[PDB]
């Protein structure tokens, strides 16, 4: 778990959310089309975990966002003047011209 990896973990969370719609619409459908209280007991029993796991997953990922201690405000960059790769790059072209 580092840098981008948590973001990828968030990708795992991403698939779950939209379905929460149809699942609810599935639950009602059990008392609707299926006309069955028991199957509604089932899918309603399933439906809540989509809520709980995602909610707790967010609260915990955010807690990770605090543990990482990434600053609340983006830093203003200095006008970077001479990272080495830029230097030996330009030098490389210099020899390339020579």
């Amino acid at each position: 778990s580092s840098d981008t990896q948590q973001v990828q973990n968030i990708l795992e969370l991403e698939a779950k959310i939209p379905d929460i719609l149809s699942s609810a619409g599935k639950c009602i459908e059990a008392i609707q089309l299926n006309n069955s209280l028991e199957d509604f007991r089932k899918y309603s029993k399933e439906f809540l975990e989509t809520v709980e796991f995602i909610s707790t997953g967010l609260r915990r990922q955010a807690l990770e966002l605090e543990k990482a201690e990434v600053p609340v405000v983006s830093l203003q960059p200095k006008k970077r003047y001479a990272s080495t790769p830029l230097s030996n790059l330009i030098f490389d072209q210099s020899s390339k011209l020579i």
Binding site: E14, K79, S83, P85, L86, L89, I90, D92, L97, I98
Partner: protein
């Protein structure tokens, strides 16, 4: 739509690039000039459903740009030619290629800012600019004109000169980036004009007037055929890396001895030559030392010897 995007951002962040949020546009954006140079640069990663693959918007003018330099003739017909170039990249994605062309464009815009800005101060060496071009009057009626890109053996030799003029300007440019570190170099400031000039181009002129003058002098001696011993000692004669060669170009005095040979009996007249970059012909004979400026005075000074010493030959 979602998974397509932030994964691309992962593709860039994996390549280690700064990232920053924008205004209400809400897209994350690349600090494409991470290697830096002078000015900051940013670019939003615009979504491109039309091409699926993302493309980066930027305020930059020309899609392509480089610091072209060229040699005008007496009729200003072009002879030499050059254009700045970059080594090829091997990106896993088109977008990163766009980032590299982007950064190189910002870079060249900044180097143009440099030569244009110096072009103000260095005009007292005779540098000129109409704004759209930069005149550099020199010997044999020529102008080393310079312009940013919009939107038999002599040709090879001059092409090598173009390589020098083009590359070294960038090297010195990087040296200026090093000088932006703000050590505040007091002693040269009074040797300097106004004020924190890049000094990216002045030495380049300096070695040229040096070359032309020493050349003219040697031709002055050859015209009457007289022996002499030129004794160079360039700062760049000694370097173990480009970092030292970088410092080889400086405001330092450049002494040059000139043990001219005249009499087959009387001693050679030492002729020190020390052109300071800013802020020159010191004769020294059998009689006494002298300090000139114009080379012609040096010539007539020799003429006093070819005259009066000949009269000394006539004394007995």
């Amino acid at each position: 739509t979602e998974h397509e995007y932030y994964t691309e951002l992962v593709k860039v962040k994996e390549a280690s690039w700064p990232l920053f949020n924008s205004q209400g546009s809400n897209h994350l954006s690349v600090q494409y000039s991470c290697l830096g140079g002078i000015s900051l640069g940013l670019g939003l990663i615009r979504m491109k459903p039309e091409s699926k693959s993302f493309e980066v918007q930027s305020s930059l003018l020309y899609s392509q740009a480089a610091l072209k330099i060229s040699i005008l003739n007496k009729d200003r017909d072009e002879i030499g030619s050059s254009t700045w170039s970059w080594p090829s990249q091997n990106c896993n994605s088109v977008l990163l290629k766009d980032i590299y062309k982007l950064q190189e464009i910002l870079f060249e815009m900044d180097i143009w800012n440099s030569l244009l800005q110096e072009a103000q101060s260095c005009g007292n060496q005779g540098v000129n600019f109409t704004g759209d071009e930069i005149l550099v009057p020199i010997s044999d009626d020529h102008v080393v004109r310079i312009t940013l890109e919009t939107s038999k053996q002599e040709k090879e030799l001059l092409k090598c000169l173009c390589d020098t003029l083009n590359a070294i300007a960038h090297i010195l440019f990087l040296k200026h980036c090093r000088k932006s570190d703000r050590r505040s170099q007091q002693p040269e400031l009074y040797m300097a004009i106004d004020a924190n000039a890049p000094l990216i181009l002045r030495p380049l002129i300096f070695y040229y007037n040096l070359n032309q003058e020493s050349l003219e002098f040697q031709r002055w001696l050859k015209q009457r055929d007289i022996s002499f011993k030129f004794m160079p000692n360039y700062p760049w004669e000694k370097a173990k890396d480009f970092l030292e060669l970088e410092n080889s170009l400086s405001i330092n005095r450049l002494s040059i001895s000139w043990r001219i040979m005249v009499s087959n009996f009387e001693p050679a007249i030492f002729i020190q030559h020390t052109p300071t970059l800013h802020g020159v012909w010191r004769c020294k004979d059998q009689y006494s030392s002298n300090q000139f400026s114009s080379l012609k005075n040096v010539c007539q000074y020799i003429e006093h010897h070819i005259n009066s010493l000949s009269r000394r030959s006539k004394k007995t």
